[PDB]
């Protein structure tokens, strides 16, 4: 039995006040026979039956443990929920005298170490001591990324890490005067929401950032920084990354598993910003050999550094391929990502050895306008139309996520021989939702 | 020709408005033939002459370049001074066509990489790329120390790193309820002034901290945290380290040189007002724990890209236990003492034959005269006596001396004798 923890973005970084308990149910993909899963919201049995039917895991061997709601409700595993004696009593009965062989958590946070210590199994949590000192936050710091990548000789867009407007102004101006647009990034931002593009020229597509600011001269930049610095620094708390922006780049990732033993490549893929990152394909398409070697080697060098300083868990290294074809790394993501369960479980375990050879994976966030009444309702239509993923042909749509009430959808992963065939499948499926 | 940069505490972390230009004159100890030194204030000639006569460095081979004063005056090498075209022109004249072989800086700051880039010699600066991304700041982060130490299996007092009062309250309570006092540390604090001790009982020795706060219970802690948090976090900017405090502990350091090629032991010592090197009264297993613990930590810092000097500080508890408390990525008050005065001036006998004791005098030229006339001045022939380390120290308000003797007892006799001179 392993202890699987479906926790969210660190409580130390932000209040998870918007969480609904949906995203983390991806935890079930990782479950194997006998595991105990901690989730903020109990999954519907139909989702459990479906995922386990594909992974080959015996549903009846799993236990799901859900804490009582906490100070922020039930949407996320807050620290007070994981410390609740009612929850702890339920977790120990779930164990039923079994030792915890391994602790796996979606996010590398001190709360997970708190839990392991309360259960008297800190040895089952790799990187336990590191996490007690909140070292896992390094996995979500772009400032830390810039220094580690630079230190490791990993290719990086030109730039710097700024704690004050005076240095920020100097570095933005240096880059703008070279004819380049610039992207500013919150140290601990999540996704494009934490970034803004600054340009001397109008009309750039907003890929990887929430806004474009067109700044004519030094005085325009003065005005921008005076206006936006509080937001950029999250109220003066954190630094701001300044780096060169490369319009029209494609975005890629190589994700690794970092354990006491070392660094292991999990998978690679492309995140498609069209202009929002609403789909991904794995493995990485349209890279030539040198570029794929650089993406993986770069990511590996970064992880070897993170390993050496004590980080343990999943690590996604994000990069761009510029229009000129250069691979440049833009950040790392220390957590089980939106990609992790897709290549590691759906790809390698469900589809099999042909994933990466015979088949590709295409994930799409449930499209605008698509509608299904329920999980079972989505499964039925896919079943009946013949478009549901089929273990015998290794083709079709895999249901990745639980039913999302607020979106009235699930999430699908199309398995196919190539991108064209997966996009075709998807459009057939569009006639159902 | 090496470029030696006498820079101060990172301008990214604090404004060095207080600096007077005295402390970084220790750069002169590191000078070797043909070097070029960047200092905020020109050293007095007699000082320069004295130091180089001891190190064997030819004085007239050296060039000292002082930038014009900057926005904060002439006390420190602020970024505006180092970027001044007048300074950079004079710097290139100092080189007179010589390539920069190595860049050595007192503090691993991005302004050093700025300088290297502007002079076209980034390859002379080890860790240049790391430094452009301000990676050097990690050498002065206690939050980073805690995570690194923990992850490296380096012995650590119990504690945590807290970004908010709620977690700080929990962790302080845990330790206090165990009957231990607690120390809170500013992440980027420089020295004891960035720490405060919390305790159930008053009267504790204020070793390594600014003040002691007596707290009776959870309500008193609420009130303390609500009132000091702004100070503790530097206005909400940084996290706060919480750890168990050990009263009556002795404090030690082991300092390493971290280069592309790896980690080299510089030296070790005890901080007593005074410091002594090598570290005394440690039994061999405690010294091994001190050095191999510091070394494990530097291996991690090396792997992540840090390059320069790294001093690991530790305490030895009542029970004889070596616990590391922080790291310091910079040329410290100790570095030139063991590395130059010890290994270069005194020689191979240092560490076997001789020890070094640093303390303030019990003007430079006057000190030289009396020491020379009395015969207490350090004598290369005997490898005994007082070395004048610095023309002046501002927080001790006098000339700084390093007594070279067979052992501590003999160093203390020499100092007492120097004391009765006047």
Contact A138 B147 (CB under 8 A): yes
Residue A26, classed as helix, strand or coil, is helix
CA B159 to chain A, closest CA, distance in angstroms equals 8
**B150–A310: do the CB atoms touch at under 8 Å?**
yes
- Is A15 an interface residue toward B (CB < 8 Å)? no
What 8-state DSSP symbol labels residue A151? H
Mutation target for A interface from B10, B70, B129: give the one with most A CBs within 10 A: B129
Region of A14 on the Ramachandran plot (φ > 0 left; ψ -120 to 50 alpha; else beta): beta
Q: Cβ-count burial of B295 within 10 angstroms (0-12 exposed, 13-18 middle, 19+ buried)? A: middle
Nearest Cα neighbor of B24 from B251, B268, B333 is: B333
Residue from A13, A82, A135, A144 to probe the interface with B (highest B Cβ count within 10 Å): A135
Please choose, from the candidates B126, B107, B73, the residue with its C-alpha nearest in 3D space to the C-alpha of residue B5.
B107
Q: Is B237 on the interface with A (CB under 8 A)?
A: yes
Angle between helices B284-304 and A142-152 (to 10 degrees): 90
Nearest-Cα residue of chain B relative to residue A149: B130
- State the number of CA atoms in the 13 A half-sphere of B355 facing the CB: 20
Q: Give the nearest partner residue to B237 out of A151, A236, A311, using CB atoms.
A: A236
> Buried b vs exposed e over A164-195: b needs ≥16 C-beta within 10 Å?
ebebbbbbbebbbeeebbbbbbbbbbeebebb
Cross-strand pairs, A413: A363, A398
Question: What 8-state DSSP symbol labels residue B230?
Answer: H
- Tell me how crowded residue B422 is: count the other CB atoms within 10 A of its CB: 8
Nearest to B306 by CA among A106, A373, A148: A148
The torsion angle over the Cα atoms of residues B16, B304, A124 and A338, rounded to 10 degrees, is: 100
Burial class (CB in 10 A: 0-12, 13-18, 19+), A326: middle
Which of A305, A311, A323 lies closest to A150, judged by CA? A305
CA distance A119 to A105: 15
Using a CB-CB cut-off of 8 Å, the residues of chain A touching B129 are: 150-151, 153
Degrees (nearest 5) of the Cα angle A107, B226, A233? 50
Beta strand spans in B290-349 (E) = 308-316, 322-328
Contact B81, B69 (CB under 8 A): yes
3-state secondary structure B355-395: EEEEEECCCHHHHHHHHHHHCCECECCCCEEEEEEEEEECC
- In Å, what resolution does this model reach? 2.0
Q: Which residue has the tokens 């000129």?
A: A324
Task: Find the discontinuities in chain B where C to next N exceeds 2.5 angstroms and give the residue preceding each.
Answer: 272, 362
End-to-end alpha carbon distance in chain B: 43
Q: Are residues B237 and B151 in the same domain?
A: yes
3-state secondary structure of A184: strand
Same domain? For B134 and B276 the reply is: yes
Of A110, A130, A148, the CB nearest to B304: A148
Classify residue A233 by its DSSP letter: T
Torsion of CA A133, A135, A140, A142, to 10 degrees: 120
Q: Are residues A145 and A270 in the same domain?
A: no
**B3, β-bridge pairs:** B36, B103
Cα angle vertex B190, ends B186, B194, to 5°?
40
Interhelix angle A218-232/A165-177, rounded to 10 degrees, is 130
Q: Is the dihedral of CA B232, B272, B158, A336 positive or negative?
A: positive
Cα three-residue angle A331-A332-A333, rounded to 5 degrees: 130
Q: Please say whether the beta carbons of A231 and A188 come within 8 A.
A: no
How many Cβ atoms sit within 10 Å of the Cβ of residue A59? 16
CA distance A147 to A132: 23
Query: B9 with B83, same domain?
Result: yes
What gap in Å lies between CA B14 and CA B190, rounded to an integer? 10
| CA–CA gap between residue B346 and residue B136 (Å, rounded) | 32
Range of the domain at A279: 126-140+248-336
Last residue of a domain, one of A247, A271, A299: A247
Test the B interface: residue of A144, A158, A241, A308 with most B CBs within 10 Å: A308
Residue A164 structure tokens: 């004050």
Give CA–CA dist B281/B294, Å, rounded.
Answer: 18
Contacts of A308 in chain B (CB under 8 A): 299-300, 303-304
Identity of the residue in A143, A161, A235 whose CB atom sits nearest the CB atom of B236: A235
Question: How far does Cα B159 stand from its chain's mean position?
Answer: 24
Q: Do residues B117 and B31 both lie within one domain?
A: yes
Among A134, A143, A147, whose Cβ lies nearest the Cβ of B161? A134
Q: How many residues does chain B have?
A: 422
Question: Are residues B354 and B417 located together in one domain of the fold?
Answer: yes
The answer to whether the CB of B308 falls within 8 A of the CB of B272 is no
Residues B48 and B119 in one domain: yes
Closest CA to B242 of B166, B160, B297, B144: B160
Q: Which two tokens stand for residue A109?
A: 């946070």
Which residues are within 8 A (CB) of B96 and not within 5 positions of it... i.e. 6 or more apart?
none
Same domain, yes or no, for A157 and A257? Answer: no
- How far apart CA A12 and CA A141 sit, in angstroms, is 13
Distance (Å) from the alpha carbon of B407 to chain A's nearest alpha carbon: 39
Interface of A with B in 94-123 (CB under 8 A): 110
Nearest to A147 among B135, B147, B153 (CB): B135
Q: How far is the C-alpha of A127 from the C-alpha of A132, rounded, in Å?
A: 9
Rounded-to-integer distance, Cα A311 and Cα B352, Å: 40
Residue from A96, A94, A128 nearest A110 by CA: A128
Give the residue from A242, A249, A255 showing the smallest Cα distance to A328: A249
Q: Work out the burial of residue B382: count CB atoms within 10 Å of its CB; fewer than 13 is exposed, 13-18 middle, 19 or more buried.
A: exposed
The residue in chain A having the minimum alpha-carbon distance to the alpha carbon of residue B159 is A133
Same domain, yes or no: A33 and A118: yes
For residue A292, give both structure tokens. Answer: 């794929």
- CA–CA dist A398, A361 (Å, integer): 10
Q: Could you say which of A293, A320, A336 is where a domain stops?
A: A336
* A211 inside 8 A of chain B by CB: no
What does the alpha-carbon distance between residue A134 and residue B143 come to, in Å, rounded to a whole number?
9
Order of strands, edge to edge, in the sheet holding B3-5? Answer: B63-65, B36-38, B3-5, B103-105
What is the token pair recorded at A152? 């490791």
b/e map A242-260, b = 16+ CB within 10 Å: bbbbbeebbbbbbbbbbee
The answer to whether the CB of A191 falls within 8 A of the CB of A206 is no
Contacts of B150 in chain A (CB under 8 A): 129-130, 132-133, 135, 310
Say if residue B178 is exposed, middle or buried (CB neighbours under 10 Å; 0-12, 13-18, 19+): exposed
Give me the residue from B132, B300, B306 closest to A160, CB to CB: B132
Q: What strands, in cross-sheet order, belong to the sheet with A36-38?
A: A63-65, A36-38, A2-5, A102-105
Question: Which residues between 359 and 418 in chain B have a beta carbon less than 8 angstroms from any beta carbon of chain A?
Answer: none
> Given CB atoms, is B161 within the 8 Å cutoff of chain A?
yes
B160 chain-A contacts, CB cut-off 8 A: 110, 132-134
DSSP letters, A185-211, are: EETT--GGGGEEEEESSS-----SSS-
Strand partners for B377: B386
Q: Which residues pair with A414 in a beta bridge?
A: A362, A397
Query: CA-to-CA distance for A245 and A175, rounded, in angstroms?
Result: 9
Looking at the structure, do residues B66 and B103 belong to the same domain, yes or no? Answer: yes
Alpha-carbon separation of residue A220 from A152, A293, A301 (angstroms): 36, 42, 39
In this structure, the answer to whether residues A277 and A130 fall within a common structural domain is yes
- Answer whether B295 touches A (CB < 8 Å): no
Residue keyed to tokens 């270069």: B344
**Which chain B residue is nearest to residue A152, measuring alpha carbons?**
B305
State the smallest CA–CA distance between residue A265 and chain B in angstroms: 20
- Residue B157 to residues A228, A388, B232, B321, B387, Cα–Cα distance (Å): 40, 56, 20, 10, 37
Chain-chain contact of B235 with A235 (C-beta, under 8 angstroms): no
Q: How far apart are CA A299 and CA A322, in angstroms?
A: 17
Domain-terminating residue out of B99, B125, B151: B125
Neighbours of B128 (CB within 10 A): 18
Which residues in chain B touch residue A130, judged by CB atoms under 8 angstroms apart? 147, 150-151
* Long-range CB pairs of B182-185, under 8 A, 24+ apart, other chains included: B182/B242, B182/B243, B182/B244, B182/B245, B183/B208, B183/B209, B183/B242, B183/B243, B183/B244, B183/B245, B184/B232, B184/B240, B184/B241, B184/B242, B185/B142, B185/B240, B185/B241, B185/B243, B185/B326
d(CA A408, CA A379): 14
Chains A, B: CB contacts within 8 A come to: 101
Residues of A within 8 A of B299 (CB-CB) are: 308
**CB of A263 within 8 A of CB of A304?**
yes
- Nearest-CA distance B228 → chain A (Å): 17
Phi, psi of B172 (to 5 degrees): -70, -45
| CB spacing of B150 vs A133 below 8 angstroms | yes
Q: Which candidate, A417, A371, A388, A407, places its Cα nearest to that of A53? A: A388
Number of domains observed in the structure of chain B: 4
The answer to whether residue B44 neighbours chain A at the CB level (below 8 Å) is no
Q: How many CB atoms lie within 10 A of CB A234?
A: 18
Examine the domain organization and report whether B339 and B420 are in the same domain.
yes
Work out the minimum CA distance from B306 to partner chain A, whole angstroms: 8
């Amino acid at each position: 039995m392993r202890l699987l923890v479906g926790n969210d973005w660190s409580e130390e970084l932000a209040e998870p006040t918007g969480s609904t308990g949906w995203a983390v149910q991806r935890l079930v993909w990782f479950a194997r026979d006998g595991d105990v899963l901690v989730l903020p919201v109990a999954p519907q049995e139909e989702f459990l039956a479906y995922v386990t039917s594909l992974t080959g895991t015996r549903r009846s061997s799993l236990t799901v443990v859900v804490p009582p709601p906490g100070r922020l409700g039930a949407g996320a595993l807050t620290a007070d929920r994981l410390a609740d004696p009612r929850f702890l009593a339920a977790l120990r009965e779930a164990f039923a005298g079994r030792p915890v062989h391994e602790v796996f958590a979606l996010w590398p946070d001190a709360v997970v170490a708190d839990l392991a210590d309360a259960l008297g199994c800190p040895e089952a949590l790799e990187g336990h001591d590191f996490l007690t000192q909140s070292g896992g936050l390094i996995g979500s710091s772009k400032a830390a990324f810039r220094a580690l990548a630079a230190g490791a000789g990993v290719a990086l867009p030109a730039g710097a890490v700024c704690a004050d407007r005076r240095r920020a102004h100097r570095h933005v101006t240096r880059l703008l005067d070279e004819g380049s647009p610039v992207i500013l990034k919150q140290d601990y931002g999540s996704g494009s929401d934490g970034n803004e593009i600054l340009s001397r020229t109008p009309g750039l597509a907003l890929r990887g950032a929430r806004a474009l600011r067109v700044l004519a001269d030094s005085a325009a930049l003065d005005a921008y920084l005076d206006e936006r610095w509080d937001w950029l620094t999250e109220g003066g708390r954190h630094r701001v990354v300044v780096e060169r922006y490369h319009p029209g780049s494609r975005a890629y990732f190589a994700e690794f598993w970092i354990s006491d033993g070392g660094v292991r490549l999990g998978g690679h893929g492309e995140m498609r910003y069209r202009p929002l990152p609403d789909s991904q394909v794995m493995p990485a398409p349209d890279l030539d050999q040198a570029q794929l070697d650089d993406l993986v080697e770069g990511g590996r060098r970064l992880c070897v550094a993170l390993h050496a300083l004590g980080y343990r868990g999943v690590l996604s290294a994000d990069a761009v391929v510029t229009p000129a074809g250069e691979v440049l790394f833009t950040e790392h993501n220390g957590r089980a990502t939106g990609s992790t369960h897709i290549y590691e479980i759906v790809g390698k375990r469900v589809v099999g050895p042909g994933f990466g050879t015979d088949r590709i994976l295409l994930e799409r966030v449930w499209p605008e306008g698509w509608e299904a009444p329920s999980f079972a309702g989505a499964l039925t239509r896919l079943r009946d139309s013949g478009h549901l993923y089929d273990p015998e042909t290794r083709r079709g749509a895999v249901i990745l996520a639980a039913y999302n009430t607020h979106r009235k959808g699930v999430m699908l992963c199309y398995v196919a021989e190539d991108l064209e065939a997966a996009l075709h499948r998807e459009e057939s499926v569009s006639r159902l939702f």
